[PDB]
Write a protein that binds this ligand. Structure first.
Ligand SMILES: O=C1OCC/C=C/CC/C=C/C(=N/OCC(=O)N2CCCCC2)Cc2cc(O)cc(O)c21
Length: 207
């Protein structure tokens, strides 16, 4: 298990998400689905130039899996996934600019729901989750587990759990007062409100 520090500006972003009083938390689901759709777009686009990129799985979809026993909401996609360098360095690097822009927009009157316009929507997970675990598999790398309870650090390790062929699974360990997002009717409402035209099938698992 390797432990890393977030870049200072991303630690600041996470603290702002965790500490700001902001009732409209449900948008976290739209931002993660949007990320999943973006990841699916990438593998699909690359597959047109190199069809062998789908040898690890042709299905392009998003599954929402609530588990009341574990108090987790899992968002599974079969997108492009993330390499180890993606997990530790690349996405963080790319996010520096968007985090800065987002912080500046909040100062000028934007609100937290607009986070996705800055390319850092993943961090909205911290509106509802005390800890987030991300399992991922990219064609060019091994399966990894990333995890963070914020506080300025994250971990990465090789994942020995069940193989996924390719994609990303975001496991939201929900805060104790955020269990509404395990309810079928609640998830259904939010997907219909915010994610109705996503161009991949979204399957809402029930319990
Ligand atoms: O695999 C994904 O993207 C790969 C292709 C890129 C697509 C653009 C949209 C993705 C935004 C993401 N931002 O993460 C920010 C970040 O530094 N982190 C550290 C590592 C763990 C994930 C979060 C990554 C991501 C998030 C997601 O909710 C679903 C996903 O399939 C992916």
């Amino acid at each position: 298990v390797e432990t890393f520090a977030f870049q200072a500006e991303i630690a600041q972003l996470m603290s702002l998400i965790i500490n700001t009083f902001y009732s409209n938390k449900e948008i976290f689901l739209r931002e993660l689905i949007s990320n999943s759709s973006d990841a699916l777009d990438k593998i699909r686009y690359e597959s047109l130039t190199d069809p062998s990129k789908l040898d690890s799985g042709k299905e392009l979809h998003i599954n929402l899996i609530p588990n009341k026993q574990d108090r987790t909401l899992t968002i599974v996609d079969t997108g492009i996934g993330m390499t180890k360098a993606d997990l530790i360095n690349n996405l963080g690097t790319i996010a520096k600019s968007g985090t800065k822009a987002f912080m500046e927009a909040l100062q000028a009157g934007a609100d937290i729901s607009m986070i996705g316009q800055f390319g850092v929507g993943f961090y909205s997970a911290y509106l509802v989750a005390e800890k987030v675990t991300v399992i991922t598999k990219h064609n060019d790398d091994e399966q990894y587990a990333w995890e963070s309870s914020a506080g300025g650090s994250f971990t990465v390790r090789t994942d020995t759990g069940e193989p996924m062929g390719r994609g990303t699974k975001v496991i939201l360990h929900l805060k104790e007062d955020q269990t509404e997002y395990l309810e079928e009717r609640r998830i259904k409402e939010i997907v219909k409100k915010h994610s109705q035209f996503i161009g991949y099938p979204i399957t809402l698992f029930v319990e």
